Design a protein around this ligand. Structure first.
Ligand SMILES: c1cnc(Oc2ccc(-c3cc[nH]n3)cc2)nc1
Ligand SMILES: *[C@@H]1O[C@H](CO)[C@@H](O)[C@H](O)[C@H]1NC(C)=O
Length: 342
């Protein structure tokens, strides 16, 4: 089990002003550290944040958090469940800022809610350095859904923070699961991100900000636009027919028009990954994520995700015999890969 620690700096807060925190399980015999960002949508104005506070309050407050959590999937310490990193130091960072991990605004007279996602990550890292992170050889910043987009937005800032604090030997890397979206034509919403950024005082990586310039920072929330600006190694996991992508596209499951739409979506996603050397993109319709216990079962071209991640580790010690890292399905319809989740 992972044990809860509330941040000692109580000014780094969840939406309602309660302190943020992290769940930790240490592994004294390991110099690998996995920091996982939880997901779960976002809110972008007073009225829809108020509704989220009524029925999704654990994503806005630490008041009701439990003292422990069980690590599952990539956060499991059992080798049978986690062939990749079972002996690592494990950290789960709850998502209580509703800002896709981008915010840097405190609660005040003018702000009913605090949006501090980017500052929560920085403060967790700072407090972990005194609990053993100072001895790490690799820090893998991972996350699912809104946490996957959060990895893309924050991995280079973690790397810069550690260099400025005096820890240049720690290698910072990212693993972005289910957070790579397309600003495509709907079958029958980027405005919500644009409004959110202003409401949150959201921050994006500096090289991406300098490309798109003032008022266009929403572009940096889209993986295919922000990824080429990043310096840290990043592995991308994305279903070709992700259920959240289809939901925002107003697709709910077929005649010819919808068949062509779905096939084109898969081709567009595959195209955006052509120049991403470390990636795992199966041809499945799914909302499943990498902290589920059966994450080992899906394969692309005969290779599982735990294997691909191990091959990525080896590559960061040119392509490796029998150990691939670029795994993108080419078949054009959901479940054309037989290993897709049920
Ligand atoms: C399932 C899927 N997604 C979420 O949260 C997100 C929602 C939208 C974005 C996003 C990024 C660029 N444009 N929209 C990112 C994360 N939560 C559950
Ligand atoms: C707590 O965090 C805030 C925001 O990063 C920072 O401004 C402040 O200096 C911190 N307090 C202490 C005592 O370090």
């Amino acid at each position: 089990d992972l044990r809860l620690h509330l941040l000692l700096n109580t000014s780094v807060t969840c939406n309602d002003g309660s302190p943020a925190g992290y769940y930790l399980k240490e592994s004294r015999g390991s110099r690998r550290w996995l920091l996982f960002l939880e997901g779960g949508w976002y809110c972008f104005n007073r009225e829809n944040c108020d509704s989220r506070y009524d029925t999704m309050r654990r994503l806005m407050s630490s008041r009701d958090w439990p003292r422990t959590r069980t690590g599952t999937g990539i956060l499991s310490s059992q080798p049978e469940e986690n062939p990749y990193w079972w002996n690592a130091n494990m950290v789960f960072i709850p998502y209580c800022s509703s800002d896709v991990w981008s915010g840097a605004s405190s609660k005040s007279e003018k702000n009913e809610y605090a949006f501090m996602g980017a500052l929560i990550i920085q403060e967790v890292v700072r407090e972990l350095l005194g609990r053993g992170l100072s001895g790490a050889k690799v820090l893998l910043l991972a996350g699912s859904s809104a946490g996957g987009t959060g990895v893309l937005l924050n991995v280079d800032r973690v790397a810069e923070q550690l260099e400025k604090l005096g820890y240049p030997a720690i290698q910072v890397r990212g693993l972005a699961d289910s957070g790579w979206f397309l600003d495509n034509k709907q079958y029958r919403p980027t405005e919500a991100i644009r409004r959110g950024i202003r409401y949150w005082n959201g921050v994006v990586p500096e090289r991406c900000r300098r490309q798109f310039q003032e008022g266009e920072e929403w572009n940096c929330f889209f993986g295919y636009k922000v990824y080429p600006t990043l310096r840290s190694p990043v592995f991308v996991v994305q279903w070709l027919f992700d259920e959240a992508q289809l939901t925002v596209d107003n697709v709910h499951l077929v005649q010819e028009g919808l068949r062509l739409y779905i096939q084109n979506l898969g081709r567009e996603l595959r195209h955006t990954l052509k120049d991403v050397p470390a990636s795992f993109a199966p041809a499945c319709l799914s909302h499943e994520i990498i902290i589920r216990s059966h994450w080992t079962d899906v394969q692309v071209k005969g290779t599982s995700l735990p294997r691909a991640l191990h091959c990525w580790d080896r590559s960061l010690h040119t392509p490796l015999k029998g150990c691939p890292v670029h795994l993108v399905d080419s078949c054009p319809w959901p479940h054309c890969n037989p290993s897709c989740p049920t």
